[PDB]
Design a binder for this molecule. Structure first.
Ligand SMILES: *[C@@H]1O[C@H](CO)[C@@H](O[C@@H]2O[C@H](CO)[C@@H](O[C@@H]3O[C@H](CO)[C@@H](O)[C@H](O[C@H]4O[C@H](CO)[C@@H](O)[C@H](O)[C@@H]4O)[C@@H]3O)[C@H](O)[C@H]2NC(C)=O)[C@H](O)[C@H]1NC(C)=O
Ligand SMILES: *[C@@H]1O[C@H](CO)[C@@H](O[C@@H]2O[C@H](CO)[C@@H](O)[C@H](O)[C@H]2NC(C)=O)[C@H](O)[C@H]1NC(C)=O
Ligand SMILES: *[C@@H]1O[C@H](CO)[C@@H](O[C@@H]2O[C@H](CO)[C@@H](O)[C@H](O)[C@H]2NC(C)=O)[C@H](O)[C@H]1NC(C)=O
Ligand SMILES: *[C@@H]1O[C@H](CO)[C@@H](O)[C@H](O)[C@H]1NC(C)=O
Ligand SMILES: *[C@@H]1O[C@H](CO)[C@@H](O)[C@H](O)[C@H]1NC(C)=O
Ligand SMILES: *[C@@H]1O[C@H](CO)[C@@H](O)[C@H](O)[C@H]1NC(C)=O
Ligand SMILES: *[C@@H]1O[C@H](CO)[C@@H](O)[C@H](O)[C@H]1NC(C)=O
Ligand SMILES: *[C@@H]1O[C@H](CO)[C@@H](O)[C@H](O)[C@H]1NC(C)=O
Ligand SMILES: *[C@@H]1O[C@H](CO)[C@@H](O)[C@H](O)[C@H]1NC(C)=O
Ligand SMILES: *[C@@H]1O[C@H](CO)[C@@H](O)[C@H](O)[C@H]1NC(C)=O
Ligand SMILES: *[C@@H]1O[C@H](CO)[C@@H](O)[C@H](O)[C@H]1NC(C)=O
Ligand SMILES: *[C@@H]1O[C@H](CO)[C@@H](O)[C@H](O)[C@H]1NC(C)=O
Ligand SMILES: *[C@@H]1O[C@H](CO)[C@@H](O)[C@H](O)[C@H]1NC(C)=O
Ligand SMILES: *[C@@H]1O[C@H](CO)[C@@H](O)[C@H](O)[C@H]1NC(C)=O
Ligand SMILES: *[C@@H]1O[C@H](CO)[C@@H](O)[C@H](O)[C@H]1NC(C)=O
Ligand SMILES: *[C@@H]1O[C@H](CO)[C@@H](O)[C@H](O)[C@H]1NC(C)=O
Ligand SMILES: *[C@@H]1O[C@H](CO)[C@@H](O)[C@H](O)[C@H]1NC(C)=O
Ligand SMILES: *[C@@H]1O[C@H](CO)[C@@H](O)[C@H](O)[C@H]1NC(C)=O
Ligand SMILES: *[C@@H]1O[C@H](CO)[C@@H](O)[C@H](O)[C@H]1NC(C)=O
Ligand SMILES: *[C@@H]1O[C@H](CO)[C@@H](O)[C@H](O)[C@H]1NC(C)=O
Ligand SMILES: *[C@@H]1O[C@H](CO)[C@@H](O)[C@H](O)[C@H]1NC(C)=O
Ligand SMILES: *[C@@H]1O[C@H](CO)[C@@H](O)[C@H](O)[C@H]1NC(C)=O
Ligand SMILES: *[C@@H]1O[C@H](CO)[C@@H](O)[C@H](O)[C@H]1NC(C)=O
Ligand SMILES: *[C@@H]1O[C@H](CO)[C@@H](O)[C@H](O)[C@H]1NC(C)=O
Ligand SMILES: *[C@@H]1O[C@H](CO)[C@@H](O)[C@H](O)[C@H]1NC(C)=O
Ligand SMILES: *[C@@H]1O[C@H](CO)[C@@H](O)[C@H](O)[C@H]1NC(C)=O
Ligand SMILES: *[C@@H]1O[C@H](CO)[C@@H](O)[C@H](O)[C@H]1NC(C)=O
Lengths: 434, 119, 119, 119, 37, 48
């Protein structure tokens, strides 16, 4: 006595992996194929709806790194390629009498350089950091890029300041937000709400420490694929920000030259003041409180009788063994040795920092970029809102780990899931067609 | 609101179909995504067409309910279940129902043609 | 002709709806233009669908005219005004009419479902 | 199967329209192909629309057979000829038949509007 | 250059040679509306 | 500019002149250094 009735527009959905749209209200992150955001974004809370979320299998991380890398490459391609700079360098020390930690860090290198006229050559002198220039045998050196890849000169007019990017669902699809405090990135979420488009996510590039990310208001959240599998990283979302002040105190000169028809090379000049090393100022009391919260959450996950130890990274390249970040186009690497140095059994820290002018972003080998120099003294202030930890039987030792930007992006995309709408469905009713 | 009734009972949720219907339609991959959304919309509209429901959100047919697919009473289905739970409970039968609906519409169209043929 | 009746009165122009309907469906940027034209067409067809007009070109409904939208008499509207002037005259009311049409169709469909439910 | 009835007689083939219709929807160049297929599908749907046939696969109309298009008897057309032979038989008259169907539907809709106007 | 001379474009950009097989005679171009416009 | 000789001055396998032993100045990772390199080519690729 029942018949099928067909309903179109039924609020049912399935897990889906589809392409998302860019939305954003020169900068390297500026996207032309990107739409202005909604002035009044809509969010609809789903009452009495519990749904399983999984950040580890979220398909938006793959889109995030694919879009960031493609955008980066597209922005870098229409710029000067430094083909005549992979030449032999004859170098000496810039300031041989320094006794500071910058002793030997900056070298003054001479080379013969092609000019606009093919017939003419011009000897050029410039300064480089010890991490970009490597000894061949004054002394002779070469640029490290010559070992593996060609250098593109990034356009000086392009800014690297992260711009929050919104990822919007295509029509027929929706994004669900867990919006559940103390959610550990996996399993049922009872607070799911529907959003057409996410909030902005900045393309912040860092390792070991998560900068300018979302804060977990209720408590520090420890997330892992398998909390007892030492091959995976532990993503820690803090419930308090830690302010960090990083700077390149030297007042550096910037010079520029023409190297070919319409092509120009920009380079580090002399130093206009006392040579000082780049460093970061981290408040000790705030870090101490942060450590306390992380330690109590780690004890909750691994047992309240376990001794916890933080130590420096045991190996890898500079991008893995040290913290890295971008400030205004300058790329800083900092030891962090004073942050992960403690054992728990139960006023201001200065971190030395190094500058690398030539970098290899996103673990890519065979491609490299030469950043332009920036004038004067640079200082930047940011918030540390999360940590990366990796675990090594009485004492569990943790190290920064890191080295994979997809974890840094997953640490922000964990709250969102993409689903496809299934507007058709059937149900029994007491209804017959004529 | 869009999917606002997702956690509501099936009966109450049947009154919000308009919102989802309007929300199904709202750089090479962006164009591809729009084309795929269009293809899915058109597949659903064609599927309603073959069922004789191209112009309606809710349409009744002549196909009986098997009762083996689900033996719940109408009160339990419409008041004590969500659409997600219902969709899960008949996930193994949906294509059978679709086939029966297509056969029913074919029989209705042929019978209608024969009735119209009478003077 | 396409838009040949555009300058004609609304009454006379109502007899050429099929010319516009047929003609509206007549490097990446060109494919984007074609896809957007398709999306606009489909949104308009979905809008007619939700109103319960199916494929009809002239769809009569159950929504009364409020007279606050336009107080002209029927003869003045159809014989002494063009569609451009009329469309401009009521541009501030279109979304209200659309909402009323959707609500009316939802009530009509529920009433039809309940009538069909009677043995 | 798809086109399985293509070699069958027109009568038998009329019972397989559903499978052939459902399979019509199923880097830059393939995206162009998808858009073109969608455009052709929508052209066919709009042609059915302007004739008042958007809701079904078999749509009877009010246009009489001219008999100049083809003077074969009904039994011959449906029991002996195939659809390819029929398409060849009337390939020169399609643009006339479609126009007549358009005019017929326009008159039908106007008549419906006048009938609805009666109190 | 300051006899010794250089091409005027040397201090602006590299200069591309147009393919001599391609005519530059203007061809009237008709602009057509997309469907719906 | 390539400088070539006969890879195999004595053989009667119908290859007596099919493979040449050629040398050239080439370029290197650094524009200032050139590296003389020797390699073998077929007579169909190398022309006088
Ligand atoms: C986390 O968020 C904070 C908050 O925004 C962010 O700090 C900001 O960084 C940007 C980028 O360095 C700062 O913007 C610069 O500030 C300096 C101040 O001296 C200006 O001089 C800069 O402009 C110069 O450089 C531009 C090119 O980069 C030129 O176009 C321009 O003409 C100038 O020459 C630029 O405005 C911003 O000021 C800070 N915020 C504050 C409050 O100071 C931090 O960097 C983020 N974290 C990470 C890892 O990025
Ligand atoms: C890099 O070394 C060169 C060579 O010593 C420096 O140029 C010389 O500087 C001295 C004074 O320090 C002058 O007396 C010479 O006439 C300069 N010669 C040339 C060819 O420049 C150069 O200044 C050094 N770079 C920096 C940044 O100091
Ligand atoms: C980090 O802290 C150190 C000291 O704790 C700061 O160093 C001082 O900087 C001022 C700047 O003019 C000097 O006058 C002082 O003599 C410095 N003292 C010492 C002990 O270094 C440093 O500037 C701070 N950096 C940031 C970015 O805040
Ligand atoms: C530049 O070329 C000249 C050529 O004689 C050479 O003597 C000089 O050492 C070269 N410069 C460098 C820095 O190698
Ligand atoms: C060039 O790359 C190899 C790859 O491991 C490395 O071992 C070598 O040290 C590099 N060259 C220099 C000068 O460091
Ligand atoms: C996340 O929390 C849920 C809460 O029940 C738990 O079942 C699940 O095992 C947790 N997963 C991880 C990786 O902590
Ligand atoms: C998680 O890690 C532990 C550590 O040994 C292992 O025994 C367990 O099988 C792992 N489970 C999964 C699902 O990876
Ligand atoms: C960063 O600089 C601001 C500038 O006033 C200062 O107030 C703040 O304390 C600094 N951060 C730390 C950790 O000292
Ligand atoms: C915070 O500082 C106090 C200073 O006595 C120390 O005893 C405590 O262990 C510190 N906590 C952490 C988590 O480092
Ligand atoms: C950080 O400091 C420790 C202190 O011993 C040192 O061993 C290590 O090499 C430093 N790291 C860098 C990158 O300089
Ligand atoms: C690391 O911790 C030990 C105490 O276990 C301390 O003696 C040492 O100085 C610390 N080193 C750094 C760089 O913080
Ligand atoms: C750095 O050098 C520039 C060059 O003109 C000067 O304007 C600026 O004031 C200098 N800054 C410091 C801190 O010496
Ligand atoms: C850092 O955290 C403080 C906490 O009040 C907040 O006011 C500030 O805007 C944050 N800054 C950044 C860059 O996240
Ligand atoms: C959610 O559950 C509560 C339980 O009392 C009920 O009152 C409410 O109507 C439910 N809402 C929905 C949308 O299911
Ligand atoms: C109900 O489903 C079973 C499944 O095998 C079938 O045998 C039975 O005939 C069906 N009854 C009706 C009335 O559809
Ligand atoms: C529906 O079935 C459930 C058990 O399946 C029963 O408890 C309930 O009373 C039934 N309601 C009606 C109206 O039959
Ligand atoms: C559908 O079939 C699968 C096969 O294992 C079974 O696990 C599932 O429970 C079935 N669901 C229904 C609603 O019959
Ligand atoms: C235009 O106006 C003139 C004025 O009398 C009228 O004769 C003609 O029919 C009108 N044509 C249209 C298309 O409105
Ligand atoms: C007609 O317009 C008036 C103007 O305020 C409004 O109050 C009334 O509700 C409208 N009626 C309908 C049926 O739209
Ligand atoms: C329509 O309204 C105008 C306004 O003045 C009036 O002149 C005309 O006679 C009216 N026509 C009818 C049929 O009411
Ligand atoms: C519609 O609104 C505009 C202002 O947005 C106003 O100028 C115009 O007169 C209004 N028209 C009607 C018919 O209300
Ligand atoms: C082809 O003709 C034979 C002749 O009897 C018929 O049996 C067969 O069914 C025809 N093929 C199709 C596909 O109808
Ligand atoms: C048949 O077609 C011819 C074509 O010229 C036409 O003259 C004739 O009137 C048509 N007859 C009918 C009954 O439609
Ligand atoms: C219909 O046409 C066929 C074609 O051969 C013929 O055999 C048959 O007798 C015709 N029937 C009538 C009633 O004209
Ligand atoms: C169509 O017309 C052409 C001449 O225009 C003629 O040769 C052909 O036989 C005609 N075909 C049909 C099926 O009428
Ligand atoms: C060289 O470039 C400058 C601007 O960079 C321009 O004014 C000048 O005219 C150029 N030289 C020649 C010969 O045009
Ligand atoms: C390599 O270059 C030198 C001159 O620098 C030349 O004499 C020699 O012949 C070259 N080698 C070859 C194989 O051409």
């Amino acid at each position: 006595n029942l018949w099928v009735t067909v309903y179109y527009g039924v609020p049912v959905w399935k897990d889906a992996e589809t392409t998302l749209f860019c939305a954003s209200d020169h900068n390297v992150w500026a996207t032309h194929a990107c739409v202005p955001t909604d002035p009044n974004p809509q969010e609809i809370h789903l009452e009495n709806v519990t749904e399983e979320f999984n950040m580890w299998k979220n398909n938006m991380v793959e889109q995030m790194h694919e879009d960031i890398i493609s955008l980066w490459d597209q922005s870098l391609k229409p710029c000067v390629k430094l083909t005549p700079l992979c030449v032999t360098l004859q170098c000496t020390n810039y300031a041989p009498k320094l006794r500071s930690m910058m002793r030997g860090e900056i070298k003054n290198c001479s080379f013969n350089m092609t000019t606009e006229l093919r017939d003419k050559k011009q000897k050029v002198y410039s300064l480089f950091y010890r991490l970009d220039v490597v000894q061949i045998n004054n002394k002779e050196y070469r640029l490290i890029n010559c070992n593996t890849s060609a250098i593109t000169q990034a356009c000086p007019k392009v800014s690297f300041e992260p711009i929050p990017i919104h990822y919007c669902a295509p029509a027929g699809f929706a994004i669900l937000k867990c919006k559940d405090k103390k959610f550990n990135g996996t399993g049922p979420c009872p607070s799911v709400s529907t959003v057409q488009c996410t909030h902005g996510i900045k393309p912040v590039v860092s390792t070991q420490l998560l900068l300018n990310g979302s804060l977990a208001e209720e408590e520090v959240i420890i997330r892992s694929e398998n909390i007892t599998n030492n091959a995976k990283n532990i993503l820690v979302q803090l419930n308090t920000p830690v302010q960090i002040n990083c700077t390149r105190p030297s007042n550096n000169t910037v010079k520029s030259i023409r190297i070919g028809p319409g092509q120009a090379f920009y380079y580090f000049g002399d130093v206009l003041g006392h040579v000082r090393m780049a460093h970061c100022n981290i408040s000790k009391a705030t870090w101490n409180e942060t450590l306390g919260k992380v330690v109590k959450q780690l004890r909750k996950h691994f047992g309240n009788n376990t001794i916890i130890r933080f130590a420096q990274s045991s190996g890898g390249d500079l991008e893995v063994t040290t913290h890295s970040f971008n400030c205004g186009g300058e790329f800083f690497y900092c030891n962090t040795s004073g942050l992960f140095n403690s054992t728990w059994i139960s006023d201001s820290l200065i971190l030395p920092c190094w500058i690398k002018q030539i970098i290899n972003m996103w673990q890519r080998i065979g491609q490299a970029m030469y950043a332009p120099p920036i004038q004067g003294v640079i200082r930047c202030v940011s918030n540390i809102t999360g940590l990366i930890l990796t675990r090594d039987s009485t004492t569990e030792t943790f190290r920064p780990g890191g080295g994979d930007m997809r974890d840094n992006w997953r640490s922000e995309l964990y709250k969102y899931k993409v689903v496809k709408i299934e507007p058709l469905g059937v149900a029994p009713t007491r209804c017959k067609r004529r | 609101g869009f999917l606002g009734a997702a956690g509501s009972t099936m009966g109450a949720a049947s009154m919000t179909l308009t919102v989802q219907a309007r929300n199904l339609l709202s750089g090479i991959k962006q164009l591809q995504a729009r084309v795929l959304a269009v293809e899915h919309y058109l597949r659903d509209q064609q599927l309603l067409g073959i069922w004789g429901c191209s112009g309606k959100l809710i349409c009744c047919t002549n196909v009986p309910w098997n009762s083996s697919w689900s033996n719940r009473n109408l009160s339990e289905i419409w008041d004590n279940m969500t659409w997600l739970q219902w969709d899960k409970e008949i996930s193994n039968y949906t294509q059978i129902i679709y086939g029966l609906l297509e056969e029913s519409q074919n029989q209705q169209e042929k019978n209608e043609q024969d009735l119209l043929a009478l003077d």
